[PDB]
């Protein structure tokens, strides 16, 4: 008769990645989390907030804003898989951009992906550099 299978692996294989800019000087952090069940299916809500807090809006000393870790749950999502921590300073979210974005625009934004099944962070910070 006919049997088969076919199975190719996919790339992308990692959901945390920090790797430096196109200087390096900086440290472009890309964090990854889930929702869909073992099953693939997202529960009712997995931690909305996914475990830590990101704070948006917040004025800088250059007059910009950017979005930064408040604080950062102790075995949640964002801690466990995400292993953010509260210093850093969220980038883009599930591709959303947040430099500049407003209070309420980065939490627009985890609203917007709230419900959603997985949420890319992209976090940057400035790594060695004086001289």
């Known amino acids: 008769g006919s049997s088969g299978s076919s199975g190719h692996s996919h790339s992308d294989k990692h959901p945390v990645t920090w790797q430096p800019s196109?200087?390096?000087?900086?440290?472009?952090?890309r964090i990854?989390?889930?929702?869909?069940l073992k099953d693939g299916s997202v529960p009712?809500?997995?931690?909305?907030?996914?475990g830590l807090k990101v704070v948006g809006g917040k004025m800088t000393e250059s007059g910009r804003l950017c979005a930064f870790i408040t604080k950062v749950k102790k075995?949640?999502?964002?801690?466990?898989?995400?292993?953010?921590?509260?210093?850093?300073?969220?980038?883009?979210?599930?591709?959303?951009?947040?430099?500049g974005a407003t209070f309420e625009e980065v939490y627009n934004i985890?609203?917007?992906?709230?419900?959603?099944?997985?949420?890319?962070?992209?976090?940057?910070?400035?790594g060695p550099s004086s001289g």
């Not at 196109?22 to 952090?29: E, P, Q, T, V």
């Not at 990854?32 to 869909?36: H, M, S, T, V, W």
């Open 75 to 99: 075995g949640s999502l964002a801690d466990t898989v995400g292993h953010l921590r509260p210093g850093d300073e969220v980038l883009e979210w599930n591709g959303r951009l947040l430099q």
């Open 32 to 36: 990854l989390l889930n929702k869909r």
């Open 22 to 29: 196109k200087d390096g000087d900086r440290l472009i952090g």
């Open 110 to 126: 985890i609203l917007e992906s709230k419900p959603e099944p997985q949420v890319e962070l992209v976090v940057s910070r400035s």
């Open 44 to 50: 009712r809500d997995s931690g909305a907030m996914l």
